[PDB]
Symmetry: C3
Subunit: 248 residues, 3 copies
């Protein structure tokens, strides 16, 4: 197999990015091409599809001789990456053998070897879906709304109308409603083709947003009785996309 | 029943204030008048009386049509209020029905409904007591002294003399003494009619001071073999008062 | 027995210093002389020798009438010292009786009495050893390397050569190597008489470095199949020295 070397400036930031996907994933196949790094995986229950796209442009050095796929234990990967410091340079290197060499370069050079595994590749595509509502909002609003809703229920209803986006949860001894309009600082964009209603499991939503930053811009696309697509951008050009099955 | 709307700027600060009283209280009757909000309660053991007085002046909007009392599960109340952000506006609103509508207004509008309960009203008054000692001290000194004393004992002796205030705890394998004079930065005022000695349970004192700030000014009034009155001010005009039975 | 009074400006810093030695020690004899305070102890397994030397020069007041030794329960000592604030003045005073009076002077005067104990004095000396390698490195590199290695193994190999210092750990499903050269910011000095290799137990190393600061300069001296000497300086003139038996 052909070697590669991939270098990312800011090892802690890369660890943070991986930790977001790791919240739902135990293991994943990483497709390494000359265009960038991609990872498409499902959580163990098959409710959430994760797609992480890291173009060559976000890496300070990118040397990929031929496209290849590697399998990674995501919890082992995250344990090693968590050792990286904020100003470390991260080097991901594969030689001829079946392990990933992970180097942090900073005040010292620290090199871990991570055994590569084989990950069953389900044929996963990200199909186009007839979403009728798009919402762009601040991470902090999304994160707090999911925490708010968890105080009352295990499911969160998403309601998009022309002028307002509402997330509402109801339980026996409580009720919570989070409302956004374009007058609100938390709502950056709202495009609604038609009144759209769908509900989503809070346990999955919590794991999806756990690593998202309070100042991150999160795009939500959904439809009535349809999955929720949730994405935010990494270093402008990278993209993390979640696709979440509705609660029906 | 008549509706009301009460608005407080700084929702996290209001949550912090409630959490102080919640440390000893499971449930409480809130008396809502045109003059302000008051709450008088005892801890489950009847050792501590809590009195919280929030005048209309500390609220940015105060619309109370007729005086009424509402009962609140304090742990449920604190769980909701803990969701408020530091720059959220807090709205407490009662309509015709038997629930409190709690709204945080900031980057988004988030509305919780809290069921109102019935709280048995003991006839609680705050009687005047012939205290012989008044002490004003920095919260940090009070908080640290109670923590210091807990290393050695379950009771803390308070000793006030003309020129010095001493808090002393004694155990078998330790002893601790905290001493203040007006030369000390921690002691803001000391008024002693006569030498005054009393002891107080550390477990109650710890719960009383847990939420007090290190820079808060705490007034202590006590007497020999008499209860301890402990108060500090909220937004200059609000007042939290504890009355603690002596250890005899 | 003769009284003494020893005063240290910055009580939290003194607590931090004691906590470093306390990580391996349950009890210790402190030798109090006119020259300073010294403490030599072994951990319960006799794998680590600790030597703490605090010259009179680091104390703001130092009144020792005659040399004497006192025994101290280190966990009780650390519990009291942890109550000191960063800007507290610390007073250690012994009167005629068999207890240490520990005073924090700041916003208030707080005085603890700590019973002195008798500590069996093993005849402990710090012998000169024919070390062949000296390494000066930043605490953060040492601390992170030990944490890195603990991800893969229970022992850490130290390898010093003319131009590079390597710490390497190997396990079944992982491997880690931390490498320093004088080009690296983490390596302040490297003096190697000959190629030097030795291994050390990570559990002991972790407890030795737990309290060391990320910006502290740590000197390591070791030899092949020889103990590791690890020291760093306290207020320029104080010294904490660990001597760690090799893993053979």
């Amino acid at each position: 197999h052909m070697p590669f070397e991939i270098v990312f400036d800011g090892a802690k930031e890369f660890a943070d990015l991986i930790a977001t996907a790791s919240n739902l994933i135990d293991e994943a196949a990483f497709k390494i091409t000359e265009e960038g790094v991609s990872m498409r995986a499902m959580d163990p229950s098959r409710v959430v599809l994760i797609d992480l796209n890291l173009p060559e442009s976000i890496f300070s050095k990118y040397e990929v001789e031929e496209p290849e796929t590697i399998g990674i234990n995501m919890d082992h990967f995250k344990k090693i990456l968590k050792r990286g410091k904020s100003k470390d340079t991260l080097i991901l290197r594969k030689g001829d053998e079946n392990f990933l060499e992970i180097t942090f370069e900073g005040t010292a050079k620290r090199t871990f070897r991570l055994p590569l595994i084989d990950v069953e590749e389900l044929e996963l595509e990200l199909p186009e879906l007839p979403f009728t509502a798009k919402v762009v909002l601040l991470g902090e609003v999304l994160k707090e709304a999911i925490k708010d809703a968890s105080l009352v229920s295990d499911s969160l209803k998403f309601i998009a109308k022309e002028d307002e986006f509402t997330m509402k949860a109801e339980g026996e001894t409580n009720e919570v409603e989070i409302k956004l309009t374009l007058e609100d600082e938390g709502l950056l964009d709202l495009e609604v083709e038609e009144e759209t209603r769908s509900a989503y499991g809070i346990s999955y939503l919590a794991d999806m947003v756990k690593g998202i930053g309070k100042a991150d811009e999160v795009t939500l696309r959904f439809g009535t009785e349809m999955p929720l697509q949730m994405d935010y951008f990494i270093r402008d050009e990278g993209k993390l996309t979640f696709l979440l099955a509705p609660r029906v």
